[PDB]
Design a binder for this molecule. Sequence first.
Ligand SMILES: CC(C)CCC[C@@H](C)[C@H]1CC[C@H]2[C@@H]3CC=C4C[C@@H](OC(=O)CCC(=O)O)CC[C@]4(C)[C@H]3CC[C@]12C
Ligand code: NA
Ligand code: NA
Lengths: 66, 466, 106, 100, 47, 103
Amino acid sequence: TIPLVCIYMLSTNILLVNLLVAMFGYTVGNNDQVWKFQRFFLVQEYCSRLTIPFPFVIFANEILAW
Amino acid sequence: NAISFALYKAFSTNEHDRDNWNGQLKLLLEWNQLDLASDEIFTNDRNWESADLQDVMFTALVKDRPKFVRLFLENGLNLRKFLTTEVLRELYTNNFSSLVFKNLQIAKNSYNDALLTFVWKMVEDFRRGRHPLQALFIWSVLQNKKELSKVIWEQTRGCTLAALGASKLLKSMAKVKNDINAAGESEELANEYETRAVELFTECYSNDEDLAEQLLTYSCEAWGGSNCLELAVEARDQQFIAQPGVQNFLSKQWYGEISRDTKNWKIIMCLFFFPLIGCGFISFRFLYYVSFFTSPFVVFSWNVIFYIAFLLLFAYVLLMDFQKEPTALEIILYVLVFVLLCDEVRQWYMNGSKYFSDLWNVMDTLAIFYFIAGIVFRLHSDESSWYSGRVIFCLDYIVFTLRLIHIFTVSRNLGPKIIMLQRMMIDVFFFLFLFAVWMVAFGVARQGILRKNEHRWEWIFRSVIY
Amino acid sequence: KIIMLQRMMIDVFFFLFLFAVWMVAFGVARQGILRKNEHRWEWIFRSVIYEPYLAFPEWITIPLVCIYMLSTNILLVNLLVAMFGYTVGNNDQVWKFQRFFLVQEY
Amino acid sequence: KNDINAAGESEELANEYETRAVELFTECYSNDEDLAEQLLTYSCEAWGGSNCLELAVEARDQQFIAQPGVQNFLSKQWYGEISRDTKNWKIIMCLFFFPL
Amino acid sequence: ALKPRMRKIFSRLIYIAQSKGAWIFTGGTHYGLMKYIGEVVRDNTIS
Amino acid sequence: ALKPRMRKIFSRLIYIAQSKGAWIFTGGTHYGLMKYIGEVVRDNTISNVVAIGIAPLYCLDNNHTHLLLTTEAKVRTQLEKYISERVIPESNYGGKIPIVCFA
Ligand SMILES: CC(C)CCC[C@@H](C)[C@H]1CC[C@H]2[C@@H]3CC=C4C[C@@H](OC(=O)CCC(=O)O)CC[C@]4(C)[C@H]3CC[C@]12C
Ligand code: NA
Ligand code: NA
């Protein structure tokens, strides 16, 4: 019973560590430019959708001188 | 700067090279003497014609003289008439280095793209047999002629495009790890074509903004076949797209033909009550409803309140209705899932087997595939499969809420918190995987201790988990 | 800490809203399974909410725990996004004005 | 810590021998990279008995080992004789099926 | 030799002449600065 | 005194002569710049300079690949004038093989 609680100390370590590593995985890794592109890529994925509402999906060279 | 300055003096004072000024130019081109050639040869008191400059220009490229190619162009040289097709194939067949050409084959295979298939076709049929100035620029940007490609870029017809397309051709070859130095110099060269295209666009955006945004969606006559904006998102040019010019263009696009100065709630109070669009309550820019219901703000705002009202009639058919007959309230719940399926077969288009690699489009697709099994379990008339059809409807009610929750999770934290989220979401996807691995371990150490010790079937392959 | 607070307070206001949306979902998937299957009134419009608050496998128990992995993801992510919503967003001037605006309201 | 000043001047002198060996290696790495990595594993005829790379890890020279020359050499070492430009999964789909 | 300084002079001049509505007398031939001048007057009759 | 500037001149010169394939006539003895010159031509025949040396008794520089041992600084003049007259039909310096004399 004394290594079983040592297992209950080793098991609750390696899961709690992975919990807090998941808590701060965003922290590591010019931070202003990187979110505006990710904001751009999601909306342009949604702008790549059809621009019709949901129930109707079954229904469906002198400027260069400036 | 001392040898060539001394060798030029003994050449110039032979008193026979007044007619043979062409000897003094190839001497000063064999060395690198820009300031001496610009002052003593190209100074207009001597008689030259600038038409025999063409065999000197061809050696000024392939001997890596980036300062003389600017000198011959500013002294008058029609580059769009000099670049004949036999001149261009003397570059790719003879003066294209084999190390970068063998770097291109590995760049084409492992990272295949519509731009690289155009370039790999271009190097091939030039080594086999029009917009030609847009082909010399490719020749100098593949081999990382860092000072020479800046000169050929200044002659191109549309330069908001070609600075971004070369920034893609470098960054798609900066990932080949055969020579990390050449892949490193291509990375720092593409960053100063991003920067070369940022300030060329903000100067184009400090002027008339409607004139700038027409250039973002130009057809380009198939340079790479893409526009200037689509060439930036595929190359992940974060400095170009995060500028306030383009981010204004998206917010003017996402609000659509509605102006962004109405309010936020002022559109939402018009979705419920259709007569309020016809008033001056919306300030968009004869039949304004087609401009209203085609802007993607109201399209996304419709597919949330319809999706919320989808669940409230999915909950109502699951409590009051659903006795034995698939009644009229369930047939609309049948076809609305099919409506929510008939767009996914178009999401089965433009996917490339990698749009299912976000681990949430698949949970929407496994949702509908879990719903058709409830339909199969429904029309079987036996009470063992009727109740088994009710249960895999009820578990699918959670998934059609977890899509709605994932809509609210993204759409509120869409901003600076979109990199904190969805990097954290995989990190908890990993943690619960390590939890479920541990629960299989703790199940075996519980099954291997308690009774039914040797009482075994394929019972044990499914009891140890739950 | 007045900009860390009251930006975080809305972020947990959003998270518990996504919890209560999920509890209505888990209530229906509990009411639609257990008895009083067709025993209905306006009882059902009010019982489905409070019932999770007080609290045949042929192959269906293995996606149920996959639901119990997907549901506990999207709520825990919103918990930690609420934990660091204050982080994103001259930080010295922005709290002294928010300190000024609250006291001048009082 | 008998004389922290002499132990402090030895610390700031070793940082400009790290820096003296970073740019002497990146200049050796801006040229032919296979020629540079032979120098990393030189026998040295027992100067300290160690190579240039093993002398850096025992001294914890963080500026020398974190440069993109040496970190490329490890990633070329950890992938081994397989090229790093195949894919990531392309090796894993060959562990299961030996004819591939 | 249309230098990058010599094209700064004769392109700021075209915008100055645009703000005043001037005439530019020059050698009407397809060479030199006179060719470079005519490209700027072609590109500045749109504003 | 091979200064750190004086070794910058006579080592950039060796790489320039490597890019052109030159000859370097110098005093073939194991002292001074002439010893420092021969070390760079030894180290740069691995990457096309040919260092021809022309000369108590001075120790001979053991880095000149072709050695040409007062009564000897007259064939040096006879050599270069035969080179400077020598027209070659490649003809980039009008032929006539460009000569520099670093002093
Ligand atoms: C009364 C009940 C039954 C219906 C509740 C209605 C809401 C579910 C709807 C109506 C207002 C909608 C919002 C109106 C404004 C936007 C801003 C938008 O944020 C952005 O700026 C997108 C990023 C960009 O492209 O700029 C994200 C969706 C959102 C919150 C909408 C999400 C869903 C909302 C909250
Ligand atoms: Na535990
Ligand atoms: Na939960």
